[PDB]
């Protein structure tokens, strides 16, 4: 039987996930990805810090101590509705990846 500290609070914005890390005593955390291109790190969070990762409904996973991992597609209580041009383009109005700035140029 083991207990470790609270899993990071999530805050949400337009195409954005922000995480507040919150420990009690030093807790091992991993930052990974498998809805995105491979990455791995390990660090101990002894003191809170915010890490912001963007997710456009791809999939980002965070691993916090001895608790189940959580993967999110940035699910909220909102939805889209027939967005995006018929020929391939990027999520939301925002210019990046340039496909809204290409018409200006």
């Amino acid at each position: 039987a083991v207990s470790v500290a609270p899993e990071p609070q999530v805050t949400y914005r337009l195409g954005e996930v922000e995480f507040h890390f919150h420990p009690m005593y030093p807790t091992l955390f991993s930052i990974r990805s498998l809805g995105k291109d491979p990455s791995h790190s390990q660090e101990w969070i002894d003191t809170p810090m915010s890490k912001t990762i963007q997710v456009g409904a791809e999939g980002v996973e965070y691993v916090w101590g001895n608790n189940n991992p959580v993967r999110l597609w940035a699910q909220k209580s909102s939805s889209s509705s027939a967005h995006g041009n018929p020929i391939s383009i990027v999520s939301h109005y925002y210019d990046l990846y340039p496909y809204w700035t290409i018409t200006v140029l």
């Binding site: 949400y12 337009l14 909220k76 209580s77 909102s78 939805s79």
Partner: protein, 54 residues
């Protein structure tokens, strides 16, 4: 998701719907009865009548 701007005019009812577009049957109505400026003060000094006795 969020976020409207009502002006501060008292007793006029403003209506907000917001979370995502579409219609709701229960929406938020909010009215301001009053703004209230309440002190947070430093007492500079006190003065009062005094009884001078000769």
């Amino acid at each position: 998701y969020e976020s409207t701007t009502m002006p501060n005019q008292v007793g006029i009812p403003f209506k907000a719907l917001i979370e995502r577009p579409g219609y709701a049957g229960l929406p938020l109505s909010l009215v301001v009865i009053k703004s209230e400026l309440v002190p947070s003060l430093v007492q500079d000094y006190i003065t009062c009548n005094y009884k001078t006795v000769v």
